[PDB]
Design a binder for these strands. Sequence first.
RNA 1: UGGAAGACUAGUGAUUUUGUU
RNA 2: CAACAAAAUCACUAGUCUUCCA
Length: 768
Amino acid sequence: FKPPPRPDFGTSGRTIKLQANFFEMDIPKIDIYHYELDIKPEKCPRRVNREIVEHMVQHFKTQIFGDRKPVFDGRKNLYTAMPLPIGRDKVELEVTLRIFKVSIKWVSCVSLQALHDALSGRLVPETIQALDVVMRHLPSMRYPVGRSFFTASSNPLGGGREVWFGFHQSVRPSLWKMMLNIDVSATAFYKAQPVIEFVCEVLDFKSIEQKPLTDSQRVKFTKEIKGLKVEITRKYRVCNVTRRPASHQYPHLPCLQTYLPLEVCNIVAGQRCIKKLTDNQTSTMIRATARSAPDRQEEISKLMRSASFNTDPYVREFGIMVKDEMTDVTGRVLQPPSILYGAIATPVQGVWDMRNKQFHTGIEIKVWAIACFAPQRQCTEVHLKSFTEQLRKISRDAGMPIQGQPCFCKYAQGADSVEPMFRHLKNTYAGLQLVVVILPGKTPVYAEVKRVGDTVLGMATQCVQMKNVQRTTPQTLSNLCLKINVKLGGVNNILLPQGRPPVFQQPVIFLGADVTHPPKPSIAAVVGSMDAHPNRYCATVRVQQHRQEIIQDLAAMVRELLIQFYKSTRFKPTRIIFYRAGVSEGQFQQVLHHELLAIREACIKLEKDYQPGITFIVVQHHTRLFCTDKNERVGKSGNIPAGTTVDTKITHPTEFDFYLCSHAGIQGTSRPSHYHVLWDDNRFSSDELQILTYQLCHTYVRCTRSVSIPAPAYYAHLVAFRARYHVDKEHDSAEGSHTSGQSNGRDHQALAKAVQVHQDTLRTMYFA
RNA sequence: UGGAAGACUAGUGAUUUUGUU
RNA sequence: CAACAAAAUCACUAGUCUUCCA
Ligand SMILES: [Mg+2]
């Protein structure tokens, strides 16, 4: 039903001063008059319409507009701080800049007093849209493309191109009052200048002084220059650039198309590079624009102050004022869970290592095989011997002792060759635990391998690149053994028992789920814990409707996971925690209605009188956050430290939600995960639930580092990814076609039974 | 397919306005 | 008050490039 109110703002963790790129407000309570306008010819651009409106205000200033500074959305909506005399008869005018006709009609008055009332009641709308239209009308003229301010910055990229900068804007509500926000997002420009400069810089001869050019020198300038307007050093447009020079079509060089020389013509300035560029030009701007988090905060702080909207009367007509400094917040660092190995590790900065640490319950690998598909000359038997030696060494060091040589090794080619050999393997060796596979590149047979590995034969198929075999390193094989161990039913590590909050002091199951869509089936996966720590997650998966977000068959999946938990522990979980990734903000009211009830239904199916406490959470932008203290800047990227939580001055004013930056920022500016708590029967405090959501980011087995979202969610994502790798035989066959519309039901049932993982594989974390 | 993460291109959904019902 | 089409914003999802990790 209704999502719960915020129980409290929390107290646990460190204290850090933090800065969000939002901006404070003044928001006067005046009523802005809003009118509707019709402009002919309607096909003209919005910027041309705004220019026509300005020209009409200037031309008809005597009796119609006066000194007013109206703001126009571009097509229909116009706004003013004072009423116009046009109310409410037919008003039409003409403008000549190239001749246009316009009309004006008054609409209504958007009251900011209603905005103030909604800010402290009526739990807020025409008001926000009108404010968004008003707040960036004039600056958008400085950008026709875009609706944001620009700076007239110079920086030659290549082939006659340059870079000019500008930042995009937004306005969102928050506690007390609204908040404007700015984020730097720039573009690129094709250079405009005299054609002599094009011959010098772009053609790049020995000097200005040449001849009918070859392909490369021509394409350096002739191909790039197409698309720009030109004038006399007479407005014209470039429609073609000919390989044949002006003499055959400095006329002896390649010319532009009517034709123009290269000595008395200047390209028109102010034209942004509209066209999408070649692959080589994608990194030409990153050569001079690769920047980190401080090189976004500093740039925003410089440019917003350089704009200085408060100083100009032309935007102070409405009286709206925005503070220069960006928003200040207080953040808290959640403590990390100590990870216990069969050795206690602290996830320091969201990273820990397997140095002198072994798995909690290792698996003794006795009978194991290798199925190589790389070329024999490129991957010889000595390479396989070296890979075997390093794999055995790393597995021995990790508490998963691989014993002796592999019992089987054969070279093979073709995708269909995996199925017989593996069958023969399980026919010729009993107790075959591990089945290593070697594949070069993105070959399709990998999918076939997993289609033999998990679905039908039930063997722990592990795959590795040819380059990794040729270039084995300790880290690669360590991370590979980390998933080989859980593929064989082992347990890598467990959360420390005493370091967990009271939610863990009773039997509890931590469900998680995710859904992935095609680039036909939409795969929804649900994972559930199987022990009290937990580390071992059983997985269920269902193909469902195209692009559907709702997990249609969640009740049966939760029933299966609860049955497995009861059989594994002979106890019923008194609490249920259900994470849910992949949900859009517009669907929460539906999701909270549906999936929660289904979970309850599963409990009703497990036992008549069974009633645990369910917690329903959803995990998810432009809401960048940066440090304020110089000492708190971490690493090369300078991102906020891992585990920081923010739940004040930028989040929802009433509902329970919080931003959490669980993962460390390798590059750029990290996007914190926004956890919106949609339901809480257990009535967790902010501290306990935030600590739980942060600690479940460290039960992830595929690597020893903190992940962005909790392990129950990304495990469902991995299960869906593996199920995608698991049966579309229309593409596999030479041809595929049938009566679509009903036969896709047959394909759906086929996918359902194909993704039904084998029993030997069902009881272990194959999805690693 | 050793693992994690942030820049561009494209699909689904929620909302304000406009046109139709 | 709801659906379809257009503009804008927002959130997810997918692809192409790109950075780091013993
Ligand atoms: Mg996902």
